[PDB]
Coordinates of C-alpha atoms in Angstrom, one line a residue:
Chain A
X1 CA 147.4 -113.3 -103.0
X2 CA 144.2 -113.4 -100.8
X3 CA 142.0 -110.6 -101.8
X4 CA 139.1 -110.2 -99.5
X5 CA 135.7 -108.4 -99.5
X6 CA 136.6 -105.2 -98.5
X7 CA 139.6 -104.8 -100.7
X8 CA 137.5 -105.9 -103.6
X9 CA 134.9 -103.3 -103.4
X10 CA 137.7 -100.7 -102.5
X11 CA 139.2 -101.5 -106.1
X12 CA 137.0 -100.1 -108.8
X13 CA 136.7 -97.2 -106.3
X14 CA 140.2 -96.2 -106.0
X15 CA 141.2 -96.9 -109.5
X16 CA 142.7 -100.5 -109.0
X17 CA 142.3 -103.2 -111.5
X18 CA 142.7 -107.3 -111.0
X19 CA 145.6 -107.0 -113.8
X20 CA 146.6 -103.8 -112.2
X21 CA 147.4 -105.3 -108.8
X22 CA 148.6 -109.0 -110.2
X23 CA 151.4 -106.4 -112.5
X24 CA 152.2 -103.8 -109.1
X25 CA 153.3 -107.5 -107.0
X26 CA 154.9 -109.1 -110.2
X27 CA 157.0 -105.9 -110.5
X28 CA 158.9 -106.9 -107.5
X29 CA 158.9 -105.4 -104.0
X30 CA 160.0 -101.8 -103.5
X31 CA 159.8 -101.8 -99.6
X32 CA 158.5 -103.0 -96.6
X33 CA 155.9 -102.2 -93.7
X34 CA 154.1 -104.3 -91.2
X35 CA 150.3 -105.7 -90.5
X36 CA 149.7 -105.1 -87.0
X37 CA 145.8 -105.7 -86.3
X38 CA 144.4 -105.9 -83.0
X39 CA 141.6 -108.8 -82.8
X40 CA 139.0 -106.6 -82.4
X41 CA 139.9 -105.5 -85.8
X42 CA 138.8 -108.4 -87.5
X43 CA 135.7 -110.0 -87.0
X44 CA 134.1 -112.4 -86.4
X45 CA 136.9 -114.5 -85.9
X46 CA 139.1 -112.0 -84.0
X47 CA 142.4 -113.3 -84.4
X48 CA 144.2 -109.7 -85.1
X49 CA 147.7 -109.7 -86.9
X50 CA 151.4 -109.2 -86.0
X51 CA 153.2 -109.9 -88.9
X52 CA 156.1 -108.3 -91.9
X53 CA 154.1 -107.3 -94.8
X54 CA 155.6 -106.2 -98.3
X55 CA 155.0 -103.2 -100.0
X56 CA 154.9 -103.1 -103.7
X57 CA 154.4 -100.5 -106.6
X58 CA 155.2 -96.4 -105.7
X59 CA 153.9 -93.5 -103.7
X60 CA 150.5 -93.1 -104.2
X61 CA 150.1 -96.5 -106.3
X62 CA 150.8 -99.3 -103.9
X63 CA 149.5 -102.1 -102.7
X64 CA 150.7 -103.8 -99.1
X65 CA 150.8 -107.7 -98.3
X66 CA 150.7 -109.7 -95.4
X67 CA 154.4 -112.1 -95.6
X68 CA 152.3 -114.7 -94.0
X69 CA 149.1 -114.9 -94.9
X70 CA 149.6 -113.5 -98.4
X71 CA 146.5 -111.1 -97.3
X72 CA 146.2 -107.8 -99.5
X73 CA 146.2 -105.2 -96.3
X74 CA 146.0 -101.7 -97.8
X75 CA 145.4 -100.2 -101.5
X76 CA 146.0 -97.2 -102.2
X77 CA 143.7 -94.6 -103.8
X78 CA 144.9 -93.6 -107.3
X79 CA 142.1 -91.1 -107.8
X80 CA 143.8 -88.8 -104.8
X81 CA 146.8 -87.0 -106.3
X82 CA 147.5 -86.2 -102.5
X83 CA 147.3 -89.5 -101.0
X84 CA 149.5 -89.4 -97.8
X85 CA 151.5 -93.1 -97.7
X86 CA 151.3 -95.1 -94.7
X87 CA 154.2 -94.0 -92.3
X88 CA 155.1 -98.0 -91.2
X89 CA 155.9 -97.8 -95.2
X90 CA 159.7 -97.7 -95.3
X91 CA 160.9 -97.7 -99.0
X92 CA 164.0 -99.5 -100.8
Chain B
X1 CA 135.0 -88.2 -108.5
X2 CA 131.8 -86.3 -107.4
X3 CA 134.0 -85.1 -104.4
X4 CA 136.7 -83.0 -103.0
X5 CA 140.0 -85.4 -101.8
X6 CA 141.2 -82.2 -100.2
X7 CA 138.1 -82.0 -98.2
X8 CA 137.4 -83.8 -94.8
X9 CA 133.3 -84.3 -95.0
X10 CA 131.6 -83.8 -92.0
X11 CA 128.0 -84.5 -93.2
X12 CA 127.0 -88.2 -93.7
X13 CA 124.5 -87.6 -96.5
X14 CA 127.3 -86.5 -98.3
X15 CA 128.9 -89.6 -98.6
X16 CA 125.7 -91.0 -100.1
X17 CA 124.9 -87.6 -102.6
X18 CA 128.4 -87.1 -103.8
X19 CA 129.4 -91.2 -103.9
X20 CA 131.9 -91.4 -101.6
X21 CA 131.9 -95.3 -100.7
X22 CA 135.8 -96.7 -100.1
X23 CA 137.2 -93.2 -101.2
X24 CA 135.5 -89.6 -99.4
X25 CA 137.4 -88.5 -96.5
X26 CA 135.0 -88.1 -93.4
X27 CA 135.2 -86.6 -90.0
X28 CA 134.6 -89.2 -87.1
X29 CA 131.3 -87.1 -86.7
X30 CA 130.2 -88.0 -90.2
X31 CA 131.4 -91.4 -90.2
X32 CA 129.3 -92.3 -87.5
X33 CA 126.1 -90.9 -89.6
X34 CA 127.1 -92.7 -92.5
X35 CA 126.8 -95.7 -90.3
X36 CA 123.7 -95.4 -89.2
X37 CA 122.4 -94.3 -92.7
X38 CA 123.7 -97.7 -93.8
X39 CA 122.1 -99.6 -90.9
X40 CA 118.6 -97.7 -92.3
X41 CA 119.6 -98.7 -96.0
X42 CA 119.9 -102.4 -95.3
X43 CA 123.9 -101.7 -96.5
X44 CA 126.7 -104.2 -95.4
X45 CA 129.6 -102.3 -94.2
X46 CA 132.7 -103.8 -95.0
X47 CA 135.2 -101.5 -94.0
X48 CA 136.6 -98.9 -91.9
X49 CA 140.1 -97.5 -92.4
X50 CA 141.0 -94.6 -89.9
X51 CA 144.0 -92.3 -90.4
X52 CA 144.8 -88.6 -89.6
X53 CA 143.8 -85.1 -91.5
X54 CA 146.9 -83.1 -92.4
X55 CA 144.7 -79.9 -93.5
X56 CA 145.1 -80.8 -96.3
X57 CA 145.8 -84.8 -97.0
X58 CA 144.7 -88.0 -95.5
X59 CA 147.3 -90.6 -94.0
X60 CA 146.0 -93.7 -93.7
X61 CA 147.4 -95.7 -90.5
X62 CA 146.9 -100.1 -91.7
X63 CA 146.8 -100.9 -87.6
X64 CA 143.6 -98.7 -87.5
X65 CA 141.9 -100.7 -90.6
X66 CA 138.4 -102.4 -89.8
X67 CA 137.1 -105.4 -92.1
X68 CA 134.1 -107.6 -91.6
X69 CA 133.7 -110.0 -94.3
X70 CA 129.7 -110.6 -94.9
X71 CA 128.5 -114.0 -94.8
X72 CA 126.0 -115.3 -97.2
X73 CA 122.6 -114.8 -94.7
X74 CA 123.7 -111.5 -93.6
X75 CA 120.5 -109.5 -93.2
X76 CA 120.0 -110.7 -89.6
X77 CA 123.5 -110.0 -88.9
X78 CA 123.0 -106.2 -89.6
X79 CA 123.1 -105.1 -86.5
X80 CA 125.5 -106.7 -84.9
X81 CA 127.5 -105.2 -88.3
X82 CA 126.6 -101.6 -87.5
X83 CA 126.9 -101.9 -83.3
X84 CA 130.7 -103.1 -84.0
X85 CA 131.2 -100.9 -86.7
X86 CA 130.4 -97.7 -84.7
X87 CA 132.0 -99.1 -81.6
X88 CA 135.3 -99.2 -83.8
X89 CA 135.3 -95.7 -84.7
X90 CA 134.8 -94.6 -80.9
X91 CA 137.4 -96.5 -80.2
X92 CA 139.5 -95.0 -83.0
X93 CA 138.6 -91.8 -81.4
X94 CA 140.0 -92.3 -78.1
X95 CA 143.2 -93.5 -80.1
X96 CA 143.6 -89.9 -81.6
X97 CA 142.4 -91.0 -85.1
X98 CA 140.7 -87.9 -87.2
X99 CA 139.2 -89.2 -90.6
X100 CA 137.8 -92.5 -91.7
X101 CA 136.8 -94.1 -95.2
X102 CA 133.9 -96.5 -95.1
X103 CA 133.2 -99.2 -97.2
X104 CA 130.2 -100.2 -98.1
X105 CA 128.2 -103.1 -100.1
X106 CA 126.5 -101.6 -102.6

């Protein structure tokens, strides 16, 4: 897994632990979604992303993972009881 | 939290009173204050993730999501950070995108 700045200060911030995202993956995926990223979305290289991604963990608790570059792409915050998932998610 | 989830901020200064780094929900008018506060700050920003307001709820879309990684002499670099950083939510805007988390360094 490739964790990078932003998801690391995202973590303490939306209840997510090191162990708690290292147990969600290990747990096995429970559906799928997809990392589409335009380049101007990620400087300063700009290279943008068009690939599958896995989901992993539940509604409300789950983390999503770019199938090629093994890039944690969303977290999702487990202080907001109402947290809306992603609609590219697509469970089972 | 120091803050309402079921709330869609539209005040930049509350982001910074109520701690809302990586979490508060913020109207594309407040994210763009919360930008400039950070530019003022010295502050890094990390992060933008865009999504829509359901009145109430926040759906976050990943194809929307910002990151700039900071390298180690960043301090010259801020405002290059906080010119792309703004530009990305006007673009967002013209997308149809209606609330945004920011992350922050801090």
């Amino acid at each position: 897994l490739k964790i990078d700045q932003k998801i690391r200060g995202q973590m303490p911030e939306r209840g997510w632990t090191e162990d708690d995202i290292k147990n969600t993956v290990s747990n096995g995926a429970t559906g799928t979604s997809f990392d589409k990223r335009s380049p101007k979305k990620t400087p300063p290289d700009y290279l943008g992303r068009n690939d599958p991604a896995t989901v992993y963990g539940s509604p409300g608790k789950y983390v999503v993972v770019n199938d090629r570059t093994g890039e944690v792409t969303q977290i999702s915050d487990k202080t907001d009881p109402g947290w809306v998932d992603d609609s590219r998610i697509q469970w089972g | 939290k120091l803050f309402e989830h079921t709330v869609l901020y539209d005040s930049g200064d509350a982001f910074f009173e109520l701690k809302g780094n990586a979490s508060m929900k913020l109207s594309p008018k407040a994210a763009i204050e919360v930008c400039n506060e950070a530019a003022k700050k010295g502050l890094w920003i990390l992060g933008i993730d865009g999504g829509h307001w359901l009145n109430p709820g926040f759906r976050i879309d990943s194809s929307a999501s910002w990151t700039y990684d900071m390298p180690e002499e960043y301090k010259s670099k801020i405002p290059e950070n906080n010119r792309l950083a703004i530009e990305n939510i006007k673009d967002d805007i013209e997308n149809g995108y209606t609330a945004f988390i920011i992350t922050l360094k801090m």
